[PDB]
């Protein structure tokens, strides 16, 4: 990490910025504004298998989103039957 964190500021950015790639939105791209935040038709893909989530059946979660092919997983795999 670093140190010497400077102070904040006040900017007037009038343009949606993907909450994933931190990039503006509007470049001939389909906006996928969600309840959480805005995202690009692409960046808005399962963070497990990178699957497109454009009006598809999935299980949205907190600060995360898993597709119907991921959400239904078995974390058990990780650890063992200690
Ligand atoms: Zn994006
Ligand atoms: Zn998935």
From Swiss-Prot:
Keywords of the record, alphabetical order, are: Acetylation, Activator, Cytoplasm, LIM domain, Metal-binding, Nucleus, Repeat, Transcription, Transcription regulation, Zinc, Zinc-finger
> As annotated in Swiss-Prot or TrEMBL, what is the tissue specificity of this protein?
Expressed only in skeletal muscle.
A GO CC term attached to the entry? Z disc
**Mind listing the GO biological process terms from this record?**
actin cytoskeleton organization; muscle organ development
Q: Name one GO molecular function term.
A: transcription coregulator activity
Does the keyword section mention Transmembrane? no
- Give its localization: Nucleus; Cytoplasm
Per UniProt, residues of the LIM zinc-binding domain are: 18-70
Domain of life the protein comes from: Eukaryota
Explain the purpose of this protein. Recruited by SOX15 to FOXK1 promoters where it acts as a transcriptional coactivator of FOXK1.
This protein's assembly is summarised as:
Interacts with SOX15; the interaction recruits FHL3 to FOXK1 promoters where it acts as a transcriptional coactivator of FOXK1.
Protein name per its UniProtKB record: Four and a half LIM domains protein 3
In its UniProt entry, the species of origin is given as Homo sapiens (Human)
Q: Which residues of the full protein are shown?
A: 30 to 98 of 280
